[PDB]
Structure formats: C-alpha cells, structure tokens
Amino acid sequence: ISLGPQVAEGENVFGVCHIFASFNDTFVHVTDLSGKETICRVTGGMKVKADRDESSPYAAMLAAQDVAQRCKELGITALHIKLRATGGNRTKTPGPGAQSALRALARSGMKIGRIEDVTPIPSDSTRRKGGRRGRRL
C-alpha cells in the first residue's frame, strides 16, 4: 500500500520502459509487466519550450529523470527496457535522445533489466512517402 506494493527486500518490482526515440521527439513510458497499466510518460516536447530541442539529449535526459523520480515515488526498482524507433517504412534507427535518456535513467538510482528492440519492421512496407526522386533539399 501507500503508492507501492508490500514486497519484501528479497524481491524487487519490475517495470517496463518504452523508449520511443525518434527524430523530433523522444517518449519515455513506464508501465507494468503487460503494458496495460501506465505509471508515467514524459517527453522532450513537454520538457523544452523551444520546439526544436524536442529530440535533444538535453530534453531527453530531463524526461528520463522525471519518470525516474516518479518511478521511485511508486517504488519501482527494476526496469525492463523496450527501445523503439519510428519503424514502419520510415527510419529504423533510434534518434539522438536514446542514449541520453538511457544514461539518465541509470544514473537516477534505477535498476535495469533486459533491453530489447520492439521497432516495427515490415515484411515489406507500403509505398514510402517522398516520391521516387527522394527529398530534394
């Protein structure tokens, strides 16, 4: 009770941290072992007010620390991690804020379980946006 379980010292509680680290934004989302129930979600867009640094490591680590103190407020100790890119037909790589948010969570008194990639990879996608001539800049 009291915003946490009654688990003894012998066993620790495992959360799940979805790090949707794309370009232009990074999501850190802590949930239970099914993901059905959520504890906290903080993103760079709601942490920086410059509209450009939504994917910056500066805003990403601040998001990670905020969900970290909230997780400790709920007594969450261990944390399996699911890293996720944009996926689909678009980019399949994590953005800049993945490593900063990951490092911030470790250094904020949290424990780390297993990191796995849940990036959506199509067998073969639909027509990707941009035309056949690419994005001529």
Added chain:
RNA sequence: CCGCGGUUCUAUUUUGUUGGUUUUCGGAACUGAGGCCAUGAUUAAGAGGGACGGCCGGGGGCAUUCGUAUUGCGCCGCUAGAG
C-alpha cells in the same frame, strides 16, 4: 540388260501372156513365264529436328496459404501536448 510366249498393220517380189500371188514373206503394234544384275538406300556433320533419363531454374498461367507493417475501428491506462 538377255533371250522364249503373248497383238494389229504395213515398203517391197519378179508363180514375166493379164487374173490370183504363199507373199508367215522382212519389220512393228499389245504381253506372260523366265535368267542375270555383287541387284539397287554415300557417311551420319564439334549442322539441324525429334525421342529417351535424371535433374535444374525469383521462367509462365491458375488455385491456396503465411507475415509484420500502414491506415481505420472499439475498450483500458495516463497526462497537454502530438506531428
């Protein structure tokens, strides 16, 4: 190729007293049974066609099935952002 059967006609004869001539008279018309030919098919193209045997191949047509992705929908969670 060689002889022996097997048809229709025809240059000439002179069986000089006319007549009848035998003129098969000579040769050419159609053919059956033969003999002989060393009897008679160039080779099978590092040309081609076809067959046969085991494969081989995102070759093609039809039918069936699997995969996540994307988009949309319905609940649940949570915050004011998301893009």
